[PDB]
Amino acid sequence: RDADTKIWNGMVGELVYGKADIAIAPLTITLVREEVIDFSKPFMSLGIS
Amino acid sequence: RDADTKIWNGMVGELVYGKADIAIAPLTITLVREEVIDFSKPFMSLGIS
Amino acid sequence: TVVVTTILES
Numbered sequence: 001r002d003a004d005t006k007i008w009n010g011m012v013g014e015l016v017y018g019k020a021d022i023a024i025a026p027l028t029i030t031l032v033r034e035e036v037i038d039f040s041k042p043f044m045s046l047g048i049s
Numbered sequence: 050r051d052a053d054t055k056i057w058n059g060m061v062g063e064l065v066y067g068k069a070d071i072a073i074a075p076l077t078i079t080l081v082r083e084e085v086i087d088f089s090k091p092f093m094s095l096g097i098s
Numbered sequence: 099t100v101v102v103t104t105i106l107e108s
């Protein structure tokens with residue numbers, strides 16, 4: 001989310017504005033993203049390594 | 050769930066029937082549990098070791 | 099048709 005404009009850009013901003021129906025992407029689950037859209041249960045685990 | 054009488058047991062059985070408002074537990078997110086009661090995103094990760 | 103949006107990353 002661009003902070004002052006409060007617009008979502010990218011794959012989530014495509015899911016927010018109704019252009020796309022689903023995203024199967026390397027899209028990490030984040031609290032700022034969870035407020036605006038839905039997520040499935042995660043399918044793959046990753047951490048700082 | 051055991052299909053001899055098709056009855057849920059344990060903590061999920063208290064969730065489905067109405068005894069439980071929440072089950073914060075070592076309750077593994079599965080498929081047959083997800084269909085009858087909700088899970089959030091998992092709070093702790095593990096596997097068979 | 100269900101729209102899949104993805105990003106290009108190997």
Ligand SMILES: NS(=O)(=O)c1cc2c(cc1Cl)N[C@H]([C@H]1C[C@H]3C=C[C@@H]1C3)NS2(=O)=O
Nearest residue numbers: 029030041042045089090091092093094095
């Ligand atoms: N340290 S840990 O293994 O208890 C652990 C385990 C997990 C954490 C974070 C930690 Cl610190 N968050 C991940 C993430 C996936 C989605 C659910 C919670 C966040 C978003 N889930 S997890 O895999 O359940």
